[PDB]
């Protein structure tokens, strides 16, 4: 509250660290369904069903332009990618599996880097 602060967490390496994690996700072999925006002209249903599309290249642009105010708003955008994948794909499909694997991969890097 006013004039009463918790000790300051050093957050000065967060930008660099989210960028590393982002690169590791970009270079994972299962990243393919997620590298680019889902083409909304060519994928029936996506525009209407998925209210907030998100992809790695869009996250990259946002990171690179100071559009994340903090590391949590970064993690939400990455989770949103995998959440969309679940909403639109069956678990028993290559894409649906990729999303599970990529989420498991992200979540380990996030813990090990920050928790």
UniProtKB/Swiss-Prot annotation:
Bromo domain segment(s): 9-113
Tissue expression profile of the protein: Expressed at varying levels in several tissues, whereas a smaller transcript was expressed specifically in testis.
Function per UniProt: Regulatory subunit of the ATP-dependent BRF-1 and BRF-5 ISWI chromatin remodeling complexes, which form ordered nucleosome arrays on chromatin and facilitate access to DNA during DNA-templated processes such as DNA replication, transcription, and repair. Both complexes regulate the spacing of nucleosomes along the chromatin and have the ability to slide mononucleosomes to the center of a DNA template. The BRF-1 ISWI chromatin remodeling complex has a lower ATP hydrolysis rate than the BRF-5 ISWI chromatin remodeling complex.
Organism placement in taxonomy: Eukaryota, Metazoa, Chordata, Craniata, Vertebrata
Protein name: Bromodomain adjacent to zinc finger domain protein 2B
Region of the whole protein represented: 2054 to 2166 of 2168
Family under the similarity heading: Belongs to the WAL family.
Summary of subunit composition and partner proteins: Component of the BRF-1 ISWI chromatin remodeling complex, at least composed of SMARCA1 and BAZ2B, which regulates the spacing of histone octamers on the DNA template to facilitate access to DNA. Within the BRF-1 ISWI chromatin remodeling complex interacts with SMARCA1; the interaction is direct. Component of the BRF-5 ISWI chromatin remodeling complex, at least composed of SMARCA5/SNF2H and BAZ2B, which regulates the spacing of histone octamers on the DNA template to facilitate access to DNA.
Cellular compartments annotated: Nucleus
